[PDB]
Amino acid sequence: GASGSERLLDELTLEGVARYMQSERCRRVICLVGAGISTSAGIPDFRSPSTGLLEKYHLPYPEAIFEISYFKKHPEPFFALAKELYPGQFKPTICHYFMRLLKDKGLLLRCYTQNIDTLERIAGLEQEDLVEAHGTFYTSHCVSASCRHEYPLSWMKEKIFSEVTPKCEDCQSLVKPDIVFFGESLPARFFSCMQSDFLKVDLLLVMGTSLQVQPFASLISKAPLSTPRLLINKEKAGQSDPFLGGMDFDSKKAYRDVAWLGECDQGCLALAELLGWKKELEDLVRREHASIDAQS
Ligand SMILES: Cc1cc(C)nc(SCC(=O)Nc2cccc(COc3ccccc3)c2)n1
Ligand SMILES: [Zn+2]
Structure with a gap:
């Protein structure tokens, strides 16, 4: 009661x-x-203004970098932002x-x-x-429905830091971190x-x-x-x-x-x-x- x-x-x-x-x-x-x-692990809340999402990635507008539609045709800003925001250490x-x-x-x-x-x-x-x-960076997937090859964070990390847009080794489609973008449903x-x-x-x-x-x-x-x-x-x-x-x-x-x-x-x-x-x-x-x- x-x-x-x-x-x-x-x-x-x-x-x-x-x-x-x-x-x-x-x-x-x-x-x-x-x-x-x-x-306290040194990972800012990107929703807190005091951190705040400085972004001359030349977007048609700010929210685009969070949108799944925009990501799929222009992924480079997201992965550039991902390299910038990548934690220097993962200490829970x-x-x-x-x-x-x-x-x-x-x-x-x-x-x-x-x-x-x-x-x-x-x-x-x-x-x-x-x-x-809200999903996770822990795994990523090829975005092609007929493939959906899974990649570990170790693979995605290397792509992010090398500044190579991640592509699927099986079909050369885009590979997306398993985080929920705007426009995507929760898992x-x-x-x-x-x-x-x-x-x-x-x-x-x-x-x-x-x-x-x-x-x-x-x-x-x-x-x-x-x-x-x-x-x-x-x-x-x-x-x-x-x-x-x-x-x-x-x-x-x-x-x-x-x-x-x-x-x-x-x-x-x-x-x-x-x-x-x-x-x-x-x-x-x-x-x-x-x-x-x-x-x-
Ligand atoms: C393993 C690991 C690896 C990394 C790149 N980051 C973290 S946590 C730090 C953090 O916030 N990173 C980050 C990276 C990119 C974009 C955004 C925010 O923008 C979006 C865009 C679309 C969906 C959801 C959020 C945040 N952890
Ligand atoms: Zn694929």
């Missing part, structure tokens, strides 16, 4: 969420994550490894991500664990998984997303009425627009939604510490970071 029935959280705080998580009531967690979980954040701990602890049902940077995979989430709602996996997972969820962990991009944002409304929802984000997000239901953190009717405001790494660290996981998290991160730093 809603605010009229027995609530699952004993209090609407990070401390209440932690007690809930270590109770028998909470077995299956869905993470919903966005660009906010990767900024404390937040990413917190989700790996969730997996290790048997609590992770699914991570739905809006990010295309592959850090969830590098952190040790497996394909079965992931719904990459079928998104809708298939959503239909099943939200029947099974005990906790929504919403991290590093302002829940402004649809249909990803609508995911929070697919939770059962009783399911607690914890937002870890720099700003409060997900409340209904008073002009145009969503999160209710602060009203007298609030019963299940909690907002922890700050950096995602710091919120996840705080939650891990409550859970008694801080040493485990520290050890995992320092080990994986050391390994990545030492890549030779």
Whole structure:
């Protein structure tokens, strides 16, 4: 039920969420994550103005570089932009490894991500664990329907840096990263998984997303009425627009939604510490970071 029935959280705080998580009531967690979980890895949110998408690629207009139609006839700008924005290193954040701990602890049902940077995979989430709602750079495909040859990121990276427009070795068609361009539908996996997972969820962990991009944002409304929802984000997000239901953190009717405001790494660290996981998290991160730093 809603605010009229027995609530699952004993209090609407990070401390209440932690007690809930270590109770028998909470077995299956869905993470919903966005660009906010990767900024501390040095990957800007290209939707944040302070980063902002300087682009004299001589486009007929700015949005074209995001459009699938334009890409297919003029791919060079996109791949030039891809070389410019290519991360200098792929080191997942404390937040990413917190989700790996969730997996290790048997609590992770699914991570739905809006990010295309592959850090969830590098952190040790497996394909079965992931719904990459906006696609990913991890794999690319020949765009010809009769071919659709798949290429790994290692192949696409070399093409991007060598500034050679990637073409299929089998048919010489364009090869496109598996990211969702404007004009493309979200992956079928998104809708298939959503239909099943939200029947099974005990906790929504919403991290590093302002829940402004649809249909990803609508995911929070697919939770059962009783399911607690914890937002870890720099700003409060997900409340209904008073002009145009969503999160209710602060009203007298609030019963299940909690907002922890700050950096995602710091919120996840705080939650891990409550859970008694801080040493485990520290050890995992320092080990994986050391390994990545030492890549030779
Ligand atoms: C493995 C890996 C490799 C790379 C090139 N980038 C990343 S993450 C950093 C990042 O944002 N990169 C990037 C590259 C190109 C375009 C855009 C944004 O424009 C679009 C255009 C169409 C669909 C979606 C987004 C962003 N990760
Ligand atoms: Zn092909």
